[PDB]
Write a protein that binds this ligand. Structure first.
Ligand SMILES: CC(C)(COP(=O)(O)OP(=O)(O)OC[C@H]1O[C@@H](n2cnc3c(N)ncnc32)[C@H](O)[C@@H]1OP(=O)(O)O)[C@@H](O)C(=O)NCCC(=O)NCCS
Ligand SMILES: CC(C)(COP(=O)(O)OP(=O)(O)OC[C@H]1O[C@@H](n2cnc3c(N)ncnc32)[C@H](O)[C@@H]1OP(=O)(O)O)[C@@H](O)C(=O)NCCC(=O)NCCS
Ligand SMILES: *C(=O)CCCCCCCCCCCCC
Ligand SMILES: *C(=O)CCCCCCCCCCCCC
Ligand SMILES: [Cl-]
Ligand SMILES: [Cl-]
Lengths: 8, 390, 391, 8
């Protein structure tokens, strides 16, 4: 599955 | 669930220790299968907990497709702070789950026996995969999902074993997949980066944060983009471009160590534009020759706490032979802004590191690990990974 | 041309343009004749005026019946135009919808005005092991052109069009057979025939009475037991699919041209279907399946005969022995074919079949089956190393 | 395609 990433 | 390799050191893997993958510790110097192709395969489905049963999801049934959409919309991947959750659309799911060669038995669901409610899922699609000096027919595994009310009850290992069995029945013994968590054993580790397109809204819903030494006015100035792309000859991909897009991609991918090997029909599926699913733009030069292309797919997310979805574009495959990659991606950003996206996401794989910082991407908090099943080979740096999944 | 003699006196205007070895050369290498193509023609090849392509949905019973009729009236005949294959509709579904089949690979030609089906060719996917290489290929079958459409270059167009449709799916090699010699056989096999109903075979001139023997003697010569003799022989069932798969996989490693079947393909090709495919396994006193035999059903039309209209023929498929002698297995196959009403039992001289053909009273046939690879360079092999049976 | 053979 994909990974949900946001701005560090 | 470990998010770093250091956390993963201090963990035991009761399930993954039983599987044909290398151990997290070991350094691999060989190339090949962990175990042989099987000349007899378990005919019976694996046992589920009492009160649950298997189903194969025929997505051509609009009602079944909506059930899968609803399961993922409510229970699929969330960010690290449980503020956003992927919101794959039904039309996107059809694109990702019915490419050439798809099989309905590889849309493997779990239902409650008495109510038939869908509470779990995993999928396989076929893909030819080039890994170092070997081309293998594999499957790509995606959409592993267990209902929030069924978590921590060993259902995910059963889902994995059952899709393994169903893929084995069709004569395929290797798989590729990604995950945001560390398992035995990544063949490569990539990191998401993010390019703000609508910074106002991103700060509002706390996807990003104001630099605190910077004001909102300065931030909107920093991230503003031209109104139209600058590359000469840029236009949407059309049917007549399918062969040259296939030819451009095939030659471009040879430089990486983990890549898809697509037929021309697969190229049509993955790249031919579909509104709100996949966008592909080609550069046709002054001689009429297509020399470059850019592509990104559409994946919005539910804002969990408070509204409109967070609209995100994901870099797909970008091939340059005449236009500088930096220019091609500048135009990708402008086109994504034009189409109403709030953020443009890209991994640091392939040559992406050459433009991420220059085009004002900011580094993300999520790693994307790449994995092979039953294929033991050396790990590689992100810049050698040439495979993008959905 | 049926002979290598007739063939060496020919110019192959079409096959000279194709990636196959020349009839004259001998091959000392192993590999593709030409590299894979990274761009493929998007437009179907042009047909003569008045004709159009049409991919055949064999799940439409009427379309299946049109294909049945085209082949029944226009497909392969013997050397002397006395018999023609009569593939049944249900058999065509078996041969044309195995795992992985594609509707666009059921490539038909229709008359634009009337919609009459006048041409066909098919491809099905198959993993093929050839010497030290395993490759995803297609098997080409059922090339047919209506009798009224012959000698007008429609067969080359059908071949190029199916090639294009296969290339679009990323496959660049094919395997196929033919009763004629073309550039260039990888192996040449001979059909042999075991009489089961000698009277009918002689009456319709499938076989003859030699000067040496009478009809009375011929009957007794070909008489068979009432029931098979092997302990524990029984039809294949669903529970046997994994072990038949295992047995077949290990048995085929001794040959040089073989299929590589998944367990689902084994189910498709071997699970018994009445009047299409028969498979019998040997389950011993411990409950272990140790051998199996199989044969498919392919009847023929008898042309221009007032009384006998059809010949019921069984074709040896794949026979695997690990504990029962192959001679015993094949003896029981003959008895089973007799019990099921067949007039004749056919088998090629490939795999280990030569070890039993004469002993079980097969007689050599007048037809060679040539085996071919498209876009693959490798040395030829003897019939005994061919381990692939098509339909 | 297959080949039709009869007794030689
Ligand atoms: C991922 C998910 C299916 C796991 O189900 P779960 O109920 O939380 O965990 P379970 O008790 O069923 O099984 C735990 C086993 O599955 C492993 N596992 C956990 N997450 C995994 C993942 N994304 N991929 C593969 N294996 C995973 C665990 O490591 C453990 O194996 P181990 O003993 O070797 O450590 C579930 O949490 C979920 O649906 N999460 C949201 C969607 C998601 O993250 N999908 C996967 C994207 S990669
Ligand atoms: C076999 C058949 C399709 C050929 O069509 P045709 O109209 O007679 O021949 P065409 O004029 O269209 O084309 C001639 C080319 O096709 C080739 N060809 C002929 N028969 C062939 C065959 N069975 N397989 C492959 N190619 C064949 C010829 O070799 C020739 O190529 P060349 O110049 O290199 O020698 C047609 O005669 C037919 O339907 N026969 C009955 C069914 C049959 O025999 N099918 C083929 C079984 S392999
Ligand atoms: C994202 O959803 C990926 C989840 C991956 C689960 C593990 C899959 C392991 C391979 C199973 C198929 C094996 C086929 C040979
Ligand atoms: C019997 O009907 C077989 C007839 C074979 C005709 C020639 C086919 C050549 C291969 C075509 C497909 C090639 C795909 C790469
Ligand atoms: Cl489906
Ligand atoms: Cl069909």
């Amino acid at each position: 599955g994909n990974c949900f990433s946001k701005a560090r | 669930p470990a998010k770093t390799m250091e956390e993963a050191s201090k963990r035991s893997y009761q399930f993954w220790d039983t599987q044909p993958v290398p151990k997290l510790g070991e350094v691999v110097n060989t190339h090949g299968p962990v175990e042989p192709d099987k000349d007899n395969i378990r005919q019976e489905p694996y046992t589920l907990p009492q009160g649950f049963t298997w189903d194969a999801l025929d997505l051509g049934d609009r009602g079944v497709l909506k059930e899968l959409y609803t399961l993922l919309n409510e229970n699929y991947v969330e960010d690290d702070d449980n503020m956003f959750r992927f919101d794959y659309s039904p039309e996107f799911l059809l694109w990702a789950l019915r490419p050439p060669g798809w099989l309905p038995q590889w849309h493997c669901g779990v239902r409650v026996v008495s109510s038939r409610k869908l509470v779990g899922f995993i999928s396989a699609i076929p893909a030819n995969i080039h890994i170092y000096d070997t081309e293998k027919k594999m499957v790509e595994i995606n959409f592993l999902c267990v209902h929030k009310k069924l978590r921590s009850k060993r259902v995910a290992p059963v889902l994995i074993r059952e899709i393994t069995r169903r893929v084995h029945l069709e004569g395929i013994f290797q798989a590729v997949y990604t995950a945001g968590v560390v398992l035995p054993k990544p063949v490569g580790t990539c990191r998401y980066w993010h390019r703000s397109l609508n910074p106002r809204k991103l700060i509002e819903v706390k996807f990003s944060h104001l630099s605190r030494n910077m004001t909102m006015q300065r931030t909107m100035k920093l991230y503003r983009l031209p109104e139209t792309p600058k590359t000469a000859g840029l236009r949407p991909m059309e049917t007549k471009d399918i062969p040259v897009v296939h030819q451009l991609l095939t030659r471009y991918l040879k430089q990486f160590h983990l890549t898809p090997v697509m037929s021309q029909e697969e190229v049509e599926h993955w790249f031919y534009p579909q509104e709100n699913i996949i966008d592909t733009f080609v550069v046709e030069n002054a001689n009429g020759e297509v020399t470059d292309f850019l592509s990104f797919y559409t994946l919005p997310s539910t804002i969990m706490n408070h509204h409109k979805s967070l609209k995100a574009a994901y870099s797909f495959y970008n091939v340059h032979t005449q236009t500088p990659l930096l220019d091609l991606m500048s135009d990708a950003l402008v086109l994504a802004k034009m189409k109403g996206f709030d953020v443009f996401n890209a991994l640091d794989l392939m040559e992406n590191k050459t433009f991420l910082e220059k085009l004002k991407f900011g580094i993300g908090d999520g790693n994307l690990q790449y994995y092979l099943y039953n294929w033991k080979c050396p790990s590689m740096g992100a810049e050698k990974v040439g495979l993008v999944l959905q």
